[PDB]
Design a protein around this nucleic acid. Structure first.
Ligand code: CL
Ligand code: NA
Ligand code: NA
Ligand code: NA
Ligand code: NA
Lengths: 459, 216
DNA sequence: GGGGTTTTGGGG
DNA sequence: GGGTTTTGGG
DNA sequence: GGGGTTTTGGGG
């Protein structure tokens, strides 16, 4: 197998050609008819990556790769821009002014993806390790071979890929549309924005909250199985999206089966600048707390920074598998999301009780401070996506006698029967917590079969 | 604010406890819609979304009568006009019926529809499943959340708060997490079903029976 | 054998 | 190939 | 022609 560079590949030979390249863009493998699937992507290498810069405006140059197959599983799933792809037996031809490489995987063509970073997107999601630096993390057919003379090629292009993404945007301005101009588009377009929030809408669907450089916020539905790599704080490129003219409560982007959501490799200058420049927005949330019914989800809390790297556990696992799952049994501190259906005790004034640390008893303060130290003893009845359909509601406690969750309300415990100020803030918070589309993001500590909230405060 | 006739109708129905009589009257007018599919699933669109119309044994007999040279299962890419229809809520298995969400469905019961054969319709966006729409899905979640909040506030009482001693001073105390599980209603099974709207009831034909009635 | 492909009958 | 299936991730 | 396969020389 002889590998040729993109700009040197023969246009006349029409013979099978092979090459190594960097993927900067790609659609998701999509079905076209009762027997064919397609995957179109943009590729570049040391010889083809940028247009004649002087009037080009630092616009990236690239060749295209169109892989045809009879089965969905015979095509590559590009989750990240910057990774490398190796193609065998591809025929090149000029398509509307550009070098278009075509390969029929259903016949004799094959491909193989290599990770530019230490781990592939999937290996990062599962916290795994790559077999080696010459091992493909994905490939077509039952076998993939790598000869010794390739290592130098692979290792070199990997170094180039990082020099390229760190020096240039790769995904230039002409490759995406500003979100605040989305409504002006005739058809579909592309986006480059940061994920401000990943809201679990239901069992199989995530609702992404996006915001790009234009400062405009948009929401879009992202299937869990299709795009399992979405993560808050990360910048992604969305290939093919449409403006939803039928949504009036919030700005919504519509994706298609061929649409794709792609992240960037660590060295990406574009992704790095955007993760910093673009800052979280709560304007949508703030404005929603004024409406009787908000069609926009609002995350009222925020967990302590030290837990931001902690994965979340559904209520289904927390209450139905915590005593039978080997893994869940070894943990006492978990993170989870949910919405409050009801709060107890009903009377907000009883939320704070006097606590006697010697008898381990607490009592009402309707009879004054003679009950001991003031503490919060609130029992939330919650529910979430993983338990949305069952006939259950689960108890999540906020017992601060030991300091856990003492600042949840941003209101220090006090006799709510006498302190009107403290009582009013809590009653208000109570209306927000039980209001539709209000959710809680919090860490909980397991204690004697119960979950107590900790390291979690309001917004 | 709204442009999708199907989205507005279905939304109002849900925001009105399935009481179709309470939905706006200025919307109960004839519905001219494009036929996206006709088999194995009959799906029409309003230019933005596609829904599944349910024909009564009457509607199909009327159609065949006034239009003998026309087969319903072959109305793909053709446009129809439903002059007599209604909307009703039904409890379904969303895992089977893709034209629903959260085991709930808003059905378009067609009593009479005329096929405006060979009428070309304006070019629109690619039609999508209404029950897959973000806002509509949220509108349905609001519906359930409301039904659940009422049931829970009626079922849960007495402030049976976990005694503070069980959480404080629990070094030698072990417990099972299912102790935190609380029933949301007097529901019979393991699924929440304590709703207030009355499930619509109208005999409808399966798209397969009409296929046999036209080419058995 | 059968796909795709063009070899359009025949290799290993 | 900057596109539209059903499996209704596709 | 060449794959994987078995057809092990020959179809469409
Ligand atoms: Cl325990
Ligand atoms: Na042959
Ligand atoms: Na042949
Ligand atoms: Na053979
Ligand atoms: Na052969």
């Amino acid at each position: 197998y002889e590998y040729v560079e993109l700009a040197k590949a023969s246009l006349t030979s029409a013979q099978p050609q092979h090459f190594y390249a960097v993927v900067i863009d790609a659609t998701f493998p999509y079905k076209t008819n009762q027997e064919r699937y397609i995957c179109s992507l943009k590729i570049v290498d040391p010889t083809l990556y940028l247009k004649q810069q002087k009037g080009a405006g630092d616009a990236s140059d690239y060749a295209t790769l169109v892989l045809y197959a009879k089965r969905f599983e015979d095509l590559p799933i590009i989750h990240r821009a910057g990774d490398i792809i190796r193609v065998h037996r591809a025929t090149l031809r000029l398509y509307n002014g550009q070098r278009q490489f075509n390969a029929n995987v259903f016949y004799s063509s094959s491909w193989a993806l290599f990770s530019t970073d230490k781990r592939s997107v999937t290996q990062e999601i599962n916290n795994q390790d790559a077999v080696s630096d010459t091992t493909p993390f994905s490939f077509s057919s039952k076998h993939a071979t790598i000869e010794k003379n390739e290592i130098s090629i692979l290792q070199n292009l990997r170094k180039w890929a990082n020099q390229y993404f760190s020096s240039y945007s790769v995904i230039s301005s002409d490759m995406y549309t500003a979100l605040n101009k989305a409504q002006a588009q005739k058809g579909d377009f592309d986006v480059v924005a940061k994920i401000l929030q990943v809201h679990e809408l239901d069992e199989y669907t995530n609702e992404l909250k996006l915001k790009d450089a234009s400062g405009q916020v948009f929401y879009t539905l992202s299937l869990k199985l299709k795009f399992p790599h979405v993560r808050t704080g990360e910048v992604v490129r969305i290939r093919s999206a449409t403006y939803d003219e039928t949504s009036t409560q919030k700005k919504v982007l519509i994706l298609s089966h061929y649409s794709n959501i792609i992240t960037f490799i660590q060295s990406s200058k574009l992704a790095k600048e955007l993760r910093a420049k673009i800052q979280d927005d709560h304007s949508v949330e703030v404005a929603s707390l004024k409406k009787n019914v908000s069609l926009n989800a609002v995350v009222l809390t925020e967990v302590d920074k030290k837990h931001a790297a902690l994965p979340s556990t559904s209520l289904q696992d927390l209450f139905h598998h915590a005593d039978s799952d080997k893994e869940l049994q070894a943990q006492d501190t978990f993170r989870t999301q949910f919405y409050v259906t009801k709060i107890e005790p009903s009377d907000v004034k009883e939320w704070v009780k006097g606590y006697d640390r010697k008898t381990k008893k607490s009592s009402s303060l309707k009879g004054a401070s003679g009950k001991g130290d003031n503490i919060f003893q609130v029992q939330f009845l919650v529910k979430d996506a993983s338990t949305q359909l069952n006939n259950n509601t689960y108890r999540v406690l906020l017992y601060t006698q030991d300091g856990l969750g003492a600042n949840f309300f941003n209101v220090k415990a006090d006799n709510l029967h006498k302190n009107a100020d403290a009582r009013k803030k809590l009653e208000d918070s109570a209306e927000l917590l039980t209001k539709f589309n209000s959710y809680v993001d919090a860490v909980v500590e397991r204690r004697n079969g119960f979950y107590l909230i900790k390291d979690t405060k309001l917004i | 604010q709204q442009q999708s006739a199907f989205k507005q109708l279905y939304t109002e129905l849900f925001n009105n406890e399935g009481d179709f009589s309470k939905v706006s009257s200025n919307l109960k007018k004839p519905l001219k819609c494009y036929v996206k599919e006709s088999y194995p699933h009959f799906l029409v669109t309003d230019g933005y979304f596609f829904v599944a119309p349910y024909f009564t044994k009457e509607a199909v007999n009327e159609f065949h009568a006034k239009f003998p040279n026309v087969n319903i299962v072959d109305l793909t890419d053709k446009v129809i006009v439903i002059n007599n229809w209604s909307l009703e809520l039904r409890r379904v298995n969303s895992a089977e019926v893709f034209t629903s969400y959260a085991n709930l469905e808003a059905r378009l019961i067609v009593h009479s529809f005329k096929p405006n054969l060979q009428e070309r319709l304006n070019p629109t966006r690619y039609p999508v499943n209404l029950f897959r729409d973000d806002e509509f899905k949220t509108t349905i979640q609001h519906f359930r959340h409301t039904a659940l909040q009422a049931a829970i506030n009626k079922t849960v009482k007495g402030d049976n708060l976990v005694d503070i001693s069980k959480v404080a001073d629990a070094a030698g105390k072990k417990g099972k997490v299912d102790a935190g599980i609380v029933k949301a209603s007097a529901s019979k099974g393991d699924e929440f079903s304590d709703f207030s709207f009355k499930e619509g009831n109208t005999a409808t034909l399966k798209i397969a029976d009409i296929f046999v009635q036209e080419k058995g």
